[PDB]
């Protein structure tokens, strides 16, 4: 070993990199994370940290030769997709900014990012209403497809001068613990979704896979301290694995759009678009709507 | 409350050390990421014989992430050594460990027995002129540009385990003249396609800058090497000259002698050589006559 290592073994750069509220292993060849691990709780997802103040930027800890840059993504047809979501870090301005490091980012389909993936991220946050602690590992995948001649081929686009790899699929592993003292078994689920528009028809369980199958596909071992001989329950059996439906998701989106409205007229389409959508505003929407209406006419026009 | 209560995910990229090579394994692709070896004049000599060796899963790799012989056999791809078995004649154990599938990538048959073999032979030749030679070998999956300008990485995966077939192979060669010489170190990096190449292109046509290979592979090679020091191009201080068609064919025909088991075989090899317009050299005839006498002394 000493003779082979005289000038050092090659470096792969896969060591875990830790930030305020997430950790990741970086793939220097693909310019994307291999896995991103985070812990979620009800306290962390509340706060005044606001994402419109954040900027995507290269991770300052990654050698520039292996880093992605904004020029790789902009105009590529692919969005900068958070693995550790910025929305999980309302409690800390620093933590949310670090999720905008490109070490946490993969090329993600625009509709997937703002749609099905967003709704999965929302479910993970929803779990904190029922579990005191939730752990999530998210990351990209590049899976094979069978060609016309029967051969299996892995094919993916690389974008920008730096050849950032666009994944065919995205995965999440969710581990939930009811409380730090409870004797209730842990709950776990693994999910793989295509990096494309999905819509509202398929239920989340349709994308569920066994942890062992995901580990074989990804070449990773998740949560290695979990005693797999112990009693560990399927999260979609102990919980709902139910994403927001179209009506719920649209009301949620329309409610958030209120806070960004800068004209009484803009504020009026939101309710108009909503109501014609056969979706009645709930009490929270109307509370935020009237508050914003009063604010807008108290500001310069 | 903390993230690591149940552990960070494991990537399995830690360096794995064997008798005369070390590697980092890619558990997703079922191939090594890099394989490092040290070569010397003493190590490439010995009585270790590759005919006794068998390909087998690396016993240290979790079976769920291992390749198996069933993935390769009948796939159209050969089991290609990264650390060559031929560099380990000094130790049967060291040679057996190069037949662990952790050292193996799916390699084009002609490339394996042809251009890559000739590069491997050049690395061994370097031990005649340098006391110490370090070599890092490994696979690559490089993109190709589509008609619309989009760049696409495409590679086959073979077997039930989806072993990744590389588009290219790389070698990084680091040579030191002696433990006491003040001569600067010599380094070269090379990238060849995983396909038949032939004899027209010289090895320097496949040479790339170390920095370029590191960008393509996502690796940093020989990190203790002081790159601000005086480091020379191996193809400037040495020849980077592979055997040509005549030399390589004579070498192959000479090796075929020792495997000949009929006088009719032994005559075919010499006939083929001559029809190739290549005259046997003195070493060929020495081995040829020894085998002819041997075959006449064996049961017919
Ligand atoms: Mg997103
Ligand atoms: Mg070979």
Curated annotation (Swiss-Prot), chain B:
Keywords: Endonuclease, Hydrolase, Membrane, Metal-binding, Mitochondrion, Mitochondrion inner membrane, Nuclease, Transit peptide. GO terms for biological process: apoptotic DNA fragmentation. Belongs to the DNA/RNA non-specific endonuclease family. This is Nuclease EXOG, mitochondrial. The keyword Cell inner membrane does not apply. The chain holds residues 60 to 359 of 368 of the full protein. It comes from Homo sapiens. It comes from the Eukaryota. GO terms for cellular component: mitochondrial inner membrane; mitochondrial matrix; mitochondrion; nucleus; protein-containing complex. Changing residue 81 to A: Abolishes catalytic activity. The active site is at residue 81. Its cofactor is a divalent metal cation.
